[model samples]
Target: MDGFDRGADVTYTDSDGSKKTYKVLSYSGDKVTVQDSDGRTLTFDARLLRVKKWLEHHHHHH
Candidate 1:
Protein backbone atom coordinates (compact mmCIF):
# COMPACT_ATOMS: atom_id res chain seq x y z
CA MET A 1 0.00 0.00 0.00
CA ASP A 2 2.12 2.86 1.37
CA GLY A 3 5.66 3.19 0.08
CA PHE A 4 6.85 2.39 3.61
CA ASP A 5 8.35 -1.08 3.70
CA ARG A 6 10.21 -3.20 6.23
CA GLY A 7 13.79 -2.29 7.11
CA ALA A 8 13.32 1.26 5.96
CA ASP A 9 15.50 3.66 7.92
CA VAL A 10 13.66 6.88 8.75
CA THR A 11 14.73 10.19 10.19
CA TYR A 12 12.08 12.18 12.09
CA THR A 13 12.36 15.89 12.67
CA ASP A 14 10.57 17.33 15.63
CA SER A 15 8.97 20.73 16.05
CA ASP A 16 12.11 21.87 17.83
CA GLY A 17 14.17 20.91 14.76
CA SER A 18 15.87 17.95 16.43
CA LYS A 19 16.11 14.64 14.61
CA LYS A 20 16.39 10.91 15.26
CA THR A 21 16.82 7.92 13.01
CA TYR A 22 15.07 4.60 13.29
CA LYS A 23 14.70 1.36 11.37
CA VAL A 24 11.32 -0.09 10.57
CA LEU A 25 10.62 -3.43 12.23
CA SER A 26 7.09 -3.97 10.97
CA TYR A 27 3.94 -2.29 9.77
CA SER A 28 0.23 -3.02 9.41
CA GLY A 29 -2.36 -0.64 8.08
CA ASP A 30 -1.64 2.70 9.77
CA LYS A 31 0.57 1.26 12.48
CA VAL A 32 4.34 1.21 12.35
CA THR A 33 6.90 -0.33 14.69
CA VAL A 34 10.52 0.66 14.61
CA GLN A 35 13.79 0.27 16.47
CA ASP A 36 15.63 3.51 17.03
CA SER A 37 19.36 4.01 16.75
CA ASP A 38 19.64 3.64 20.52
CA GLY A 39 18.24 0.10 20.26
CA ARG A 40 14.89 1.03 21.78
CA THR A 41 11.82 0.02 19.85
CA LEU A 42 8.54 1.91 19.65
CA THR A 43 5.26 1.78 17.77
CA PHE A 44 3.29 4.65 16.32
CA ASP A 45 -0.05 5.18 14.64
CA ALA A 46 0.95 6.54 11.27
CA ARG A 47 -2.38 8.26 10.82
CA LEU A 48 -1.52 10.75 13.57
CA LEU A 49 1.56 11.98 11.81
CA ARG A 50 1.01 15.13 9.76
CA VAL A 51 4.06 14.53 7.63
CA LYS A 52 6.59 11.84 6.73
CA LYS A 53 9.08 12.64 9.45
CA TRP A 54 11.32 10.85 11.89
CA LEU A 55 9.94 8.48 14.48
CA GLU A 56 11.19 10.58 17.38
CA HIS A 57 13.34 13.54 18.24
CA HIS A 58 15.22 14.42 21.44
CA HIS A 59 17.03 17.54 22.53
CA HIS A 60 19.01 18.51 25.64
CA HIS A 61 21.14 21.47 26.53
CA HIS A 62 23.92 20.87 28.99
Candidate 2:
Protein backbone atom coordinates (compact mmCIF):
# COMPACT_ATOMS: atom_id res chain seq x y z
CA MET A 1 0.00 0.00 0.00
CA ASP A 2 1.20 3.51 -0.73
CA GLY A 3 -0.44 4.85 2.41
CA PHE A 4 -3.28 6.57 0.63
CA ASP A 5 -5.21 7.26 3.82
CA ARG A 6 -5.34 11.01 3.34
CA GLY A 7 -8.34 12.97 2.09
CA ALA A 8 -10.33 16.10 2.84
CA ASP A 9 -13.64 17.83 2.30
CA VAL A 10 -13.15 21.16 0.60
CA THR A 11 -15.58 24.07 0.98
CA TYR A 12 -15.82 26.94 -1.42
CA THR A 13 -18.19 29.76 -2.27
CA ASP A 14 -20.42 29.13 -5.21
CA SER A 15 -21.73 31.74 -7.59
CA ASP A 16 -25.22 31.63 -6.09
CA GLY A 17 -24.30 32.45 -2.53
CA SER A 18 -23.93 28.84 -1.52
CA LYS A 19 -21.05 26.94 -0.01
CA LYS A 20 -20.01 23.92 -2.01
CA THR A 21 -18.38 20.97 -0.31
CA TYR A 22 -16.14 18.56 -2.20
CA LYS A 23 -14.68 15.38 -0.73
CA VAL A 24 -11.05 15.49 -1.81
CA LEU A 25 -9.51 12.04 -2.22
CA SER A 26 -6.12 10.80 -3.33
CA TYR A 27 -3.15 13.11 -3.51
CA SER A 28 -0.23 12.32 -5.76
CA GLY A 29 2.60 14.78 -6.06
CA ASP A 30 0.92 17.91 -7.48
CA LYS A 31 -2.50 16.58 -8.36
CA VAL A 32 -5.64 15.96 -6.31
CA THR A 33 -9.03 14.37 -6.91
CA VAL A 34 -12.23 15.34 -5.15
CA GLN A 35 -15.56 13.58 -4.91
CA ASP A 36 -18.52 15.60 -3.89
CA SER A 37 -21.43 14.42 -1.73
CA ASP A 38 -23.36 13.79 -4.92
CA GLY A 39 -20.85 11.19 -6.08
CA ARG A 40 -19.29 13.43 -8.70
CA THR A 41 -15.51 13.40 -8.81
CA LEU A 42 -13.12 16.00 -10.21
CA THR A 43 -9.42 16.66 -10.25
CA PHE A 44 -7.54 19.77 -9.23
CA ASP A 45 -4.09 20.94 -8.27
CA ALA A 46 -2.44 20.18 -4.94
CA ARG A 47 -2.62 23.82 -3.95
CA LEU A 48 -5.89 22.96 -2.21
CA LEU A 49 -4.14 20.58 0.16
CA ARG A 50 -4.67 22.80 3.15
CA VAL A 51 -8.41 22.64 2.73
CA LYS A 52 -8.18 18.87 2.46
CA LYS A 53 -6.22 18.62 5.69
CA TRP A 54 -8.84 20.59 7.56
CA LEU A 55 -11.62 18.49 6.15
CA GLU A 56 -9.98 15.22 7.09
CA HIS A 57 -9.51 16.41 10.66
CA HIS A 58 -13.15 17.47 11.00
CA HIS A 59 -14.99 14.98 8.81
CA HIS A 60 -17.19 13.75 11.65
CA HIS A 61 -18.56 17.14 12.57
CA HIS A 62 -20.96 17.22 9.67
Which candidate has the top score in lDDT? 1
TM-score of each: 0.60, 0.50
lDDT for each candidate structure: 0.66, 0.60
Residue 52 of model 1, lDDT score: 41
User: Compared with the true structure, what per-residue lDDT tens digits does model 2 show for residues 1-62?
Assistant: 22334445666545686666676677666777777667788776556434533556667776
Candidate 1, run of 10 with poorest lDDT: 47-56
Model 2: residues with Cα > 4 Å off, grouped in runs? 1-7, 14-18, 49-62
Residue 10, candidate 2: Cα error in Å is: 1.4
* Candidate 2, residue 14: how far the Cα is off, in Å: 4.6
| lDDT tens digits by residue: candidate 1, 1-62 | 46666667666656788677667788878888877778898886665333344333532443
C-alpha root-mean-square deviation, each candidate: 9.7, 7.0
TM-score, candidate number 1: 0.60
Q: CA shift at 20, candidate 2, in angstroms?
A: 1.1
